[PDB]
Amino acid sequence: KELVLALYDYQEKSPREVTMKKGDILTLLNSTNKDWWKVEVNDRQGFVPAAYVKKLAAAWSHPQF
* Residues composing the chain: 65
Report the CATH architecture of 1-65: Roll (2.30)
DSSP string, 14-62: STTB--B-TT-EEEEEE--SSSEEEEEETTEEEEEEGGGEEE--TTSPP
Domain boundaries, the chain: 1-65
- Resolution (angstroms) stands at 2.3
How distant, in Å, are the alpha carbons of 27, 31, 60, 64 from that of 38? 9, 7, 22, 24
How distant, in Å, are the alpha carbons of 33, 59, 60, 61 from that of 20? 19, 25, 23, 23
Rounded to 5 degrees, φ, ψ at 29 are -90, -35
